Design an enzyme around this catalytic site. Structure first.
Site: not given
Ligand SMILES: [Ca+2]
Length: 781
Positions: A328, A373, A461, A523
């Site tokens: 992750h 991030h 996507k 997800s």
């Molecule tokens: Ca992320």
């Protein structure tokens, strides 16, 4: 079994000349770099330095050459490097870069210039293979003793002599332990003075084992020897055979696939061990106490099931059939909000065998996409740099497919660049089209990992009556998802790269079944997945027989802490994403289990989890039809070489699997004070009476200092666990060997011989995974 021990060419044993340099200094020195004959150490001498310099290949992470090496930028080093060997060979073609670290987050670096490109390439290929050799990484304590022996006779040897000083420094920094070492050397008949040295001639391995016997007080062996010999004298061939076939063997292990030991084999093994320990003092078919200890420490008694360690699993089932090692927010090397982003972390994560990575893509100010991030104070890296990093490392340790999870926030213009750089970086590796036999139509199963070897798949996507209670839970799920809650619309160039791993909005399990699209996946933030698991656990398991679920941690885990992955593996989820930079229990277990199957990053789910006609509730507290329940007993007896100083230690044993089989903070040994060399716990056995689903479970040994400081651990999946008396070499958090540090234990493994809503009861069951299960359970009610 295809696994082989390191085979070191004479060229590397003799050694090659390199120029060595460091970042932040203009200096350089020519060295003769060498490998020991067993492929355990790189070593070299620096003129005027007392100690021979070395790198323990147990902590080497990568070695790179040519375009992947880092060339020097300092003028004086560059000039020297260009002149070293042939000046007609470009500098960078001669460069070799090594990275090493106890863990893979805190790396140190060694930089070398070879005389030519062939030498740089040969060393890079050879050293990498030794660092990732599974047999070497899994060797038993006698193998680690031999590693020390080869260090002493190659790295530390001075004019065909082994200095006593070198023997002591390799074993302990403690004064009392150094005295024990001297006394042991004396007992064997070797020089034991502070400034003495032993002749290579007199320093043979079998005498080195006699030194082990003289050094450690393995008190337990006397009682164990009495037990196995039936108090009748030496252990006879027949007694040894029954020991191997009854105590050291799982009673349900298939007797044709794994044949029983015979008389003739056991007589021969006894001769091997008695030859090593007693030479012509050996007696035919009679194993002595010292011969037994030798066996218990040797490869014949290795706890690791070689058929599981090898890449032996069936890799020709649908992708949905596997647990796939997953990372992750892979770019982050620390805290989620204040930490750094990195390119090198992508190489390091792929080198563990991790197969599924995450790339959070944002518009860069200069028109070039970045990874970071979003809406935090994290640093940024170039997307282009990351994909070239992925392209380098993707298939160095595993041939099996990689999945890149894109969280896409880019404008159309920068998405064009994402697609462009994927194409240019990955080339043929990129799976940009469906393969033969597997069109993207309903009812068509996903391809197999075998079909997709050396392929990178893009997850992105594609081109574009709920109640109030349900809408509120969904809002919480979206909040917990953080930046993943809202991505940009897909540009056609990015959409075009997506095929088998198409992320779609999850609605219901009924709807997924109706649509019958095996290439649609979801997800889920852990909050969403927990709601599904608690509402419809059986349906979740069934969904994962044909389609893929990815799970990732909620946004509130700002310190990059992890959930325990078994929570989701129990429901058959394949891509259970973890923060690789946080070496908590979750990562320790993850790296432990994915070492198996060749460190490929793929583990085949248990058959019962793949059977389409079977319903399975992972919250069951009763035996599952068609799956034999187990009992596990672990007696912690002793430990060896925990530390180079006199520490106080204890040992804990935990189990993780189904909630009903998960046991944390229950079993802890007494503390043995001021002994880092040979603590003798002799603890009453720890009993795991009823393991409902052994093949979903692992048992774990954790060794700590009295103050709670982690020393080492070992994860042992119950699928293929080997019972009996075992040495258990310890691993660090990244699952690399500590070396000599080991626990000695006895293992029993055999077949088991006989709330106001479901949601609330299931939530309570999940408290077993927490760091403090009782406190978590108390806090819920
Ligand atoms: Ca992320």
């Amino acid at each position: 079994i295809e696994l082989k021990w390191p085979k070191v060419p004479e060229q590397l044993i003799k050694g090659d000349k390199f120029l060595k340099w460091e970042e932040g200094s203009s200096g350089f020195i020519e060295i003769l770099l060498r490998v020991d004959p067993k492929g355990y150490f790189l070593y070299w001498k620096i003129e005027g330095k007392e100690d021979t310099q070395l790198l323990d290949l147990a902590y080497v992470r990568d070695i790179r050459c040519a375009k992947y090496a880092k060339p020097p930028k300092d003028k004086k080093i560059k000039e020297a490097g260009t002149n070293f060997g042939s000046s007609n060979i470009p500098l960078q073609d001669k460069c070799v870069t090594i990275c090493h670290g106890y863990n893979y987050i805190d790396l140190e670096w060694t930089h070398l210039v070879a005389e030519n490109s062939s030498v740089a390439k040969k060393w890079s290929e050879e050293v990498f293979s030794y660092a990732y050799n599974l047999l070497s990484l899994n060797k038993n304590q006698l193998g680690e003793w031999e590693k020390l022996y080869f260090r002493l006779t190659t790295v530390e040897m001075e004019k065909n002599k082994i200095p006593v000083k070198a023997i002591q420094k390799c074993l302990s920094k403690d004064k009392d332990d150094r005295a024990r070492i001297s006394k042991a050397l004396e007992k064997i008949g070797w020089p034991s003075g502070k400034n003495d040295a032993i002749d290579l001639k007199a320093f043979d391995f079998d005498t080195f084992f006699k030194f082990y016997l003289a050094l450690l007080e393995r008190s337990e062996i006397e009682g164990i020897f009495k037990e196995l010999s039936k108090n009748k004298g030496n252990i006879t061939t027949v007694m040894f055979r029954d020991f191997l076939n009854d105590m050291q063997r799982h009673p349900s292990l298939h007797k044709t696939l794994f044949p029983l030991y015979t008389d003739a084999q056991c007589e021969a093994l006894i001769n091997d061990y008695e030859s090593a320990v007693n030479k012509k003092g050996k007696k035919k078919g009679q194993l002595t106490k010292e011969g037994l200890l030798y066996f218990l420490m040797c490869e014949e008694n290795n706890l690791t099931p070689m058929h599981r360690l090898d890449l032996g699993a069936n890799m020709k089932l649908t992708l949905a059939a596997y647990y796939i090692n997953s990372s992750h927010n892979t770019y982050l090397t620390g805290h989620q909000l204040t930490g750094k982003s990195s390119v090198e972390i992508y190489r390091q994560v792929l080198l563990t065998g991790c197969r599924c990575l995450e790339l959070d893509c944002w518009d860069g100010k200069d028109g070039e996409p970045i990874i970071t991030h979003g809406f935090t104070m994290c640093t940024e890296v170039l997307f282009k740099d990351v994909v070239y990093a992925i392209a380098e490392s993707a298939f160095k340790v595993s041939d099996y497919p990689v999945i890149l999870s894109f969280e896409n926030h880019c404008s159309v213009a920068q998405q064009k660049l994402l697609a462009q750089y994927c194409n240019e970086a990955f080339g043929e590796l990129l799976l940009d089209k469906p393969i033969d036999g597997h069109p993207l139509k309903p009812g068509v199963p996903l391809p197999t990992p075998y079909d997709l070897r050396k392929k990178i798949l893009i997850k992105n996507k594609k081109m574009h009556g709920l109640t109030d209670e349900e809408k509120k839970k969904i809002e919480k799920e979206k909040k917990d998802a953080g930046t993943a809650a809202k991505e940009a619309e897909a540009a056609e160039e990015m959409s075009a790269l997506v095929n088998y791993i198409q992320p779609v909005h999850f609605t219901t399990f009924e709807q997924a079944q109706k649509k019958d699209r095996h290439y649609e996946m979801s997800s889920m933030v852990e909050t969403q997945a927990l709601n599904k698991l608690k509402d419809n656990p059986e349906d979740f398991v069934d969904y994962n027989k044909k389609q893929i679920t990815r799970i990732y941690p909620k946004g509130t885990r700002v310190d990059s802490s992890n959930y325990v992955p078994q929570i989701y593996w129990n429901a058959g989820c394949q891509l259970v994403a973890l923060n690789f930079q946080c070496f908590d229990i979750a990562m320790c277990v993850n790296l432990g289990v994915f070492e198996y199957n060749g460190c490929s990053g793929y583990l085949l789910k248990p058959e019962f989890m793949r059977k389409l006609d079977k319903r399975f509730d992972p919250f069951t507290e009763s035996t599952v039809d068609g799956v034999v329940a187990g009992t596990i007993e672990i007696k912690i007896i002793s430990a060896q070489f925990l530390s180079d100083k006199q520490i106080s230690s204890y040992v804990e044993v935990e189990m993780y699997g189904l909630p009903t089989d998960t046991v944390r903070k229950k079993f802890k040994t007494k503390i043995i004070e001021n002994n880092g060399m040979d603590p003798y716990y002799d603890e009453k056995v720890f009993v795991f009476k009823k393991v409902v689903l052994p093949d979903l479970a692992v048992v774990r040994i954790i060794v700590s200092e009295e103050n709670g400081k982690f020393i080492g651990h070992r994860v042992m999946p119950l699928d293929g666990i080997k019972p009996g008396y075992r040495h258990v070499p310890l691993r660090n958090e990244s699952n690399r060997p500590l070396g000599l540090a080991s626990v000695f234990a006895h293992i029993v493994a055999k077949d088991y011989v006989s709330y106001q809503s479901a949601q609330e009861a299931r939530a309570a069951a999940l408290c077993a995974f927490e760091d403090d299960p009782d406190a978590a359970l108390n806090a819920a009610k």
